[PDB]
Symmetry: C2
């Protein structure tokens, strides 16, 4: 992973990134450019954009704050930035798919929220029906950028890629969290930020895997299935300590709780016990 | 040798563990899932012999009232834990054979597939300009399908006469599909793991026809929607596909509940569809 930048700027990778970003549509950024205008803009300024990226002279623009229906706050990068973030992710994704845990399902190829529910249900129905529901503050509102770049540097040795990725963290990229309402569809502004959050939280997956914990994770939304109420409280304190001390994230001790499945709301699903099947099952909550 | 592959020690042991893991209600014999190991330790070789000579006779399914989480009940046919054990053993060998044939846009009761993947694929089609949906509703599969027509289509792939026999006997026993996915319920279905595979084998014929016509579709068991670009082509697809389902597959289309509509009038696998103004694209959420 030394000359990774040239793989990102290749003709085929940029063409596929441009097609995916147009297909994803989405609102406009601070420059007001619609996704229907990216084609002619790259045809006239694409080579200059590539040259600016090689010499680390491309300056990403800040994301636009958009209120979306209550209301939801999202950070929308410009369509040019979404195009570049997609070009980076297409190269970084296959590298990190070899490291990621099988029980991580958020914003990954061929993975969705229902798979996480299914795996968690199979764990509950083996006797691990005491749920540790760790609530984290907004990832990109609390992550230390240098902490994240160091973790990325263990695998990515191309400094040009490290430099441009760091700049997009500065731009304010974040995670469209509409999955919490069981919404299915294309997220906004999430070409690169979800992958970055998975690289970070993969350190939590490896720690939980080290301790033999049964868990599923979707972005920064994780639940842990354990066999007793007391070990649940021990796992609760041990993992929350690891999240704050080793990763620098903040555990919301007001929302985090230990509970039975029927008290858990995860990825928009609730949990109930099927008396006929003699198993826990899941369905959307109110 | 296909029968002997189903009756091998490795296959039957995997089938026992999976059926015990699925738990479930008792069949007509009142045997609980925790009693299958002692029963197989006694009559295991006897059942294997009866299956080799086509002498084993499955028990009829038990009509169980399954309480729904939001009130009311569903009626479901539950095979005995012995028959669920044998149905799983058969399905474990037949699944790799038919996974090679199945269309990528079929998601019902398949390994590593789920309803959300069908929704995501349908969303990508709608947002590409195919926002006219053919919503064909089928009468329940296992009280309308012709057993001979189904066994013939199965026979064109499976040539083992001992496997064709026991599969047909399980059709007569009344196996059916747990349709709780229609209420967005996620979890292990009841009623054995053989009937959904049989339904997919039948409806895979429809998948190949729709693919031959270049149609955009997703299918989950017998619940299929087709994404087309215009209203007149939607009515044309509605007429042509409905005729193919009834004439070539012998299934029955519910003309009252079938319709041509736009996404926000469609309810599919417990999901509804809405338009995200800011994202400028359709999305989905539980209805
Ligand atoms: K959580
Ligand atoms: K349908």
């Amino acid at each position: 992973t030394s000359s990774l930048m040239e793989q990102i700027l290749s003709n085929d990778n940029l063409n596929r990134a441009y097609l995916q970003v147009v297909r994803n549509k989405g609102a406009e950024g601070v420059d007001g450019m619609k996704y229907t205008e990216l084609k002619e803009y790259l045809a006239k300024n694409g080579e200059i954009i590539k040259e600016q990226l090689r010499i680390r002279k491309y300056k990403p623009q800040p994301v636009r704050r958009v209120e979306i229906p209550g209301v939801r706050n999202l950070g929308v990068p410009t369509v040019t930035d979404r195009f570049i973030q997609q070009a980076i992710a297409q190269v970084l994704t296959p590298i990190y798919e070899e490291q990621f845990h099988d029980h991580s399902y958020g914003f990954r190829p061929n993975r969705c929220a229902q798979q996480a529910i299914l795996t968690a249900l199979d764990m509950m129905n083996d006797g691990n029906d005491w749920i540790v529901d760790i609530d984290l503050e907004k990832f990109f509102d609390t992550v230390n950028h240098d902490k994240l770049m160091t973790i990325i540097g263990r695998t990515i040795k191309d400094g040009d890629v490290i430099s441009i990725v760091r700049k997009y963290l500065v731009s304010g990229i974040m995670i469209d969290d509409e999955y919490e309402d069981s919404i299915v569809g294309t997220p906004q502004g999430g070409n690169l930020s979800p992958l970055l959050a998975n690289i970070m939280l993969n350190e939590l997956d490896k720690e939980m895997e080290k301790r033999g914990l049964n868990f599923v994770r979707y972005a920064d939304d994780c639940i842990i299935m354990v066999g007793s109420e007391m070990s649940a409280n021990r796992v609760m304190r041990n993992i929350s300590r690891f999240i704050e001390e080793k990763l620098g994230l903040k555990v919301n001790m007001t929302k985090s709780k230990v509970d039975r499945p029927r008290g858990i709301k995860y990825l928009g699903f609730g949990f109930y016990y099927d008396t006929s099947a003699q198993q826990f099952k899941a369905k959307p909550h109110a």
